[PDB]
């Protein structure tokens, strides 16, 4: 499987950091405090692929932790999940780990492959969790930019 190291920032230029061990939060970082941002290993995985929709998995660089989408309290929810390092990453990732990376103007959206029209989202407020949102274009932010990181 092919992977790329990268960071993501929402369209209000908020960076993503580890809040605790299994959740991310978004905040305005600049200067030296930018080193706190999470580095992802974005893998290019198997799945329904169209011209502007590319299936990917989002793991934390050098960690057996992946973003995944599951029902929690009957609601589609974003979580960070531990995996066996002997088996990951792989091309055939389980559906809960797959996101459709979609190009929108000069930005990116990450739609859950398991839950159509549910997206990786951030709140306008500072220091709030990254979550899975069923709206795109409301108060919640569903578009991002990607920055490439050295191998």
């Amino acid at each position, epitope marked *: 499987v092919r992977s790329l190291n990268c960071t993501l920032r929402d369209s209000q230029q908020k960076s993503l950091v*580890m*809040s*605790g*061990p*299994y*959740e991310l939060k978004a905040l305005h970082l600049q200067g030296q405090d930018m080193e706190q941002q999470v580095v992802f290993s974005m893998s290019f995985v198997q799945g329904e692929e169209s011209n502007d929709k590319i299936p990917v998995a989002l793991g934390l660089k*050098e*960690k*057996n*932790l992946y973003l995944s989408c599951v029902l929690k309290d009957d609601k589609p929810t974003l*979580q*960070l*999940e*531990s*995996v*066996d*390092p*002997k088996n990951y990453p792989k091309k055939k990732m389980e559906k809960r780990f797959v996101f459709n990376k979609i190009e929108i103007n000069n930005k990116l959206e990450f739609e859950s492959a398991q839950f159509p029209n549910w997206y990786i989202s951030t709140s306008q407020a500072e220091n709030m*969790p990254v979550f899975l949102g069923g709206t795109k274009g409301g108060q919640d932010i569903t578009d991002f930019t990607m920055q490439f990181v050295s191998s």
Partner: antibody, heavy 118, light 108 residues
Framework: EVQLVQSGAEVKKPGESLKISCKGS????????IGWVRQMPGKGLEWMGI????????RYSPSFQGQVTISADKSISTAYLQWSSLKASDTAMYYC???????????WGQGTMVTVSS | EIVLTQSPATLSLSPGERATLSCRAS??????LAWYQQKPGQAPRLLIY???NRATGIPARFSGSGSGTDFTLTISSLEPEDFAVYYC?????????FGQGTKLEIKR
């Protein structure tokens, strides 16, 4: 069976260095955070710090930052807690525990009793 | 960061009776609250995770509820093994405070 097994009871004198261990079994050790918790005699639980064994990413409680070192040897599924200079007030039971995406310590070690006295 | 306040400090009851233990957070956070049981001379063990879910192998007589800052642990009918110290815990960003504990003692 998922378990964490800790090293034996230690008896030391103030100023001495010490390293205690926490061994994981029945699961992929590399994949879960390990936390360290102190329990002074007759007192409650206090979180000290946490480490991700895959890349040794470590976070300490402000009360313990610079006073102890948390480390891990993922090749033998072992997490460590170490002091370069023990105090008599470090006399406590120390537990290691596995932290999960449920925001809980689901598996705990049996504890390592550390007695510090001249 | 946040403080967790447990009450009562000692709860004295008999086997067969219902027990209610309280844990109150100083501030409301989005992390999941957990309850731990520590029997005398033993290591703590997870009882409840995310305020109301029983951990693996925990008997049905244990239940949990609450939201916001107010949490409760209930034992519908006490067994002699349930007389132990109970602690609540809720992560605050990267800090992990515990409540000060409640001792459940046998009234005879």
């Amino acid at each position: 069976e998922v378990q964490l097994v800790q090293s034996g009871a230690e008896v030391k004198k103030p100023g001495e260095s010490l390293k205690i261990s926490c061994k994981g079994s029945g699961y992929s050790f590399t994949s879960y955070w390990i936390g360290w918790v102190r329990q002074m005699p007759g007192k409650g639980l206090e979180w000290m710090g946490i480490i991700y064994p895959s890349d040794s990413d470590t976070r300490y409680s402000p009360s313990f930052q610079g006073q102890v070192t948390i480390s891990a040897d993922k090749s033998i599924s072992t997490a460590y807690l170490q002091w370069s200079s023990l105090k008599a007030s470090d006399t406590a039971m120390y537990y290691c525990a596995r932290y999960t995406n449920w925001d809980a310590f689901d598996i705990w070690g049996q504890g390592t009793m550390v007695t510090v006295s001249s | 960061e946040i403080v967790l306040t447990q009450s009562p400090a000692t709860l004295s009851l008999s086997p067969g009776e219902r027990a209610t233990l309280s844990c109150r957070a100083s501030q409301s956070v989005s992390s999941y609250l957990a309850w731990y049981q520590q029997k005398p001379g033993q290591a703590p063990r997870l009882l409840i995770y995310d305020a109301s879910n029983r951990a693996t192998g925990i008997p049905a007589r244990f239940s949990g509820s609450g939201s916001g800052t107010d949490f409760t642990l209930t034992i519908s009918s006490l067994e002699p093994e349930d007389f132990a110290v109970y602690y609540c815990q809720q992560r605050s960003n990267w800090m992990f405070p515990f409540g000060q504990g409640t001792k459940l003692e046998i009234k005879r």
